[PDB]
Design a protein around this ligand. Structure first.
Ligand code: HEM
Ligand SMILES: N#Cc1ccc([C@@H]2CCCc3cncn32)cc1
Length: 463
């Protein structure tokens, strides 16, 4: 009863013209919408032919489960060519984000204890809480410096600085000063290189290195120069940490472990640094936006955080356990606005998705934008209702929330990202109320990650 792979519904359109249409623009900003529309038309599975190959698109938790069942010991995710190109050119190692096969697993097993283990989280969470406190106090100060105790501003830069500040402190044990009003020029240079590296990544990742090296030599120059600044900052930090180990951070533990070479430690530390760029910031912004649009949800989160403020202050780690509604609020935000638009696996072995045979080597992509909007799973999917997550009780409900991926290749920074998001929202919601003038949905664009095209100004008010 299993249908052949070739009988799978195909998305209409010309696979070759569409690829040229992508190169015409160095982007595919409406990917989430165009895929979402196709699901509505053809069902929960279809093939998207693009150029010489394509992708099988799915959106159901049961498909995620079947994908994790055929996860080999080395789950295969396509490497990001422009990033790999820089490593080979300069002679750097590739980290877990870019690696595949045995070398990935070798690196992964020697990183999990220092990045994901409960002991690791116990270590750096008080560090993140400190940075979150600085942000909230600085913001609360600006609000009260105002005439009416109310401030309207663009919070994306400051929140983005927070995520970089907190992550860099956990990774290298150094404060960049980005939450302060006057950071050093070195810190600003580093931050600019990160932004340029991400920008140039989008410009290059949609065509082969063979071609893009002709059509855009200056983009590659910007990309490698940005990476040079990043790896230069990483070399300095790792060297400094190493010297001081002969007389507290994630890299220090990795150096003490001595399981990975200094080059491998650096490679993974740069991909962890890159991992906090244009990721954690956006769920934070979209949560604030939705809390401004749903005052009752915001007030419920404030009562929760105010009730647990004392214990959290004594033990910051309690923010990850004693704030269940805030955790649900993050699930609801990521349900509607997943950072990673899709999860990607190259089928290591044959499998069956939606009664269709999937040959080994097929590129399968789970589109979370469509997964989270399935009404049969999230009734009234357009509604921002964090309470739904305390009530879900399906047998396979652990696959309803996979914004960080699944299996052994799941986001290595998940615990760090969750800590950063929870601690910031907790400390902000304690003393401040967020409001928005516009109540309409804002547009998202797919540019490597899913982000708002133009996040609006928000108004903060003291209680
Ligand atoms: C809301 C925030 C974030 C989301 C939604 C997110 C999402 C993801 C997803 C979907 C993957 C692919 C997992 C898979 O293929 O199964 C991934 C991988 C990864 N993420 Fe994140 N990420 C976030 C933040 C971060 C942060 C802050 C860091 C580092 C400080 C980070 C580091 C990594 C790394 C190193 C990998 C590669 C893991 C591997 O391939 O073994 N991420 N992330
Ligand atoms: N598949 C996939 C996939 C898509 C985007 C991302 C993003 C972007 C690159 C670095 C990063 C760290 N954490 C999340 N990300 C990660 C994975």
């Amino acid at each position: 009863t299993v249908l052949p792979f070739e009988a799978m519904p195909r998305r209409p359109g010309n696979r070759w013209l569409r690829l040229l249409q992508i190169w015409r623009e160095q982007g595919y900003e409406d990917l989430h919408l165009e895929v979402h529309q196709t699901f509505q038309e053809l069902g929960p599975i279809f093939r998207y032919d693009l150029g010489g190959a394509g992708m099988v698109c799915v959106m159901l938790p049961e498909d995620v489960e079947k994908l994790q069942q055929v996860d080999s010991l080395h789950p295969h995710r396509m490497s990001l060519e422009p990033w790999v190109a820089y490593r080979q050119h300069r002679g750097h190692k590739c980290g877990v984000f870019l690696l595949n096969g045995p070398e990935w697993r070798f690196n992964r097993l020697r990183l999990n204890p220092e990045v994901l283990s409960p002991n690791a989280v116990q270590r750096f969470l008080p560090m993140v809480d400190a940075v979150a406190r600085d942000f909230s106090q600085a913001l609360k100060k600006k609000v009260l410096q105002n005439a009416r105790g109310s401030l309207t501003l663009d919070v994306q830069p400051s929140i983005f600085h927070y995520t970089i500040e907190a992550s860099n402190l956990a990774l290298f044990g150094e404060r960049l000063g980005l939450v302060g009003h006057s950071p050093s020029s070195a810190s600003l240079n580093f931050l600019h290189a990160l932004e340029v590296m991400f920008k140039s990544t989008v410009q290059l990742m949609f065509m082969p290195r063979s071609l893009s090296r002709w059509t855009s030599p200056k983009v590659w120059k910007e990309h490698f120069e940005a990476w040079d600044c990043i790896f230069q900052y990483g070399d300095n930090c790792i060297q400094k940490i190493y010297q001081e180990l002969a007389f507290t951070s994630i890299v220090a533990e990795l150096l003490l472990n001595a399981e990975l070479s200094p080059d491998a430690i650096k490679a993974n530390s740069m991909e962890l640094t890159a991992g906090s760029v244009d990721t954690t910031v956006f769920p934070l912004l979209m949560t604030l936006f939705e809390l401004a649009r749903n005052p009752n949800v915001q007030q419920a989160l404030r009562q929760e955080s105010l009730a647990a403020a004392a214990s959290i202050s004594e033990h910051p780690q309690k923010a990850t356990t004693e704030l269940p509604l805030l955790r649900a609020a993050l699930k609801e935000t990521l349900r509607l606005y997943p950072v990673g638009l899709f999860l990607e696996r190259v089928a290591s072995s044959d499998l069956v998705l939606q009664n269709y045979h999937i040959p080994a080597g097929t590129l399968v992509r789970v589109f979370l934008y469509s997964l989270g909007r399935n009404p049969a799973l999230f009734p009234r999917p357009e509604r921002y209702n964090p309470q739904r997550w305390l009530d879900i009780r399906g047998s396979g409900r652990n696959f309803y929330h996979v914004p960080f991926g699944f299996g052994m290749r799941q986001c290595l920074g998940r615990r760090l990202a969750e800590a950063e998001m929870l601690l910031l929202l907790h400390h902000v919601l304690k003393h401040l109320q967020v409001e928005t003038l516009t109540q309409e949905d804002i547009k998202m664009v797919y540019s490597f990650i899913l982000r708002p095209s133009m996040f609006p100004l928000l108004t903060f008010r003291a209680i």
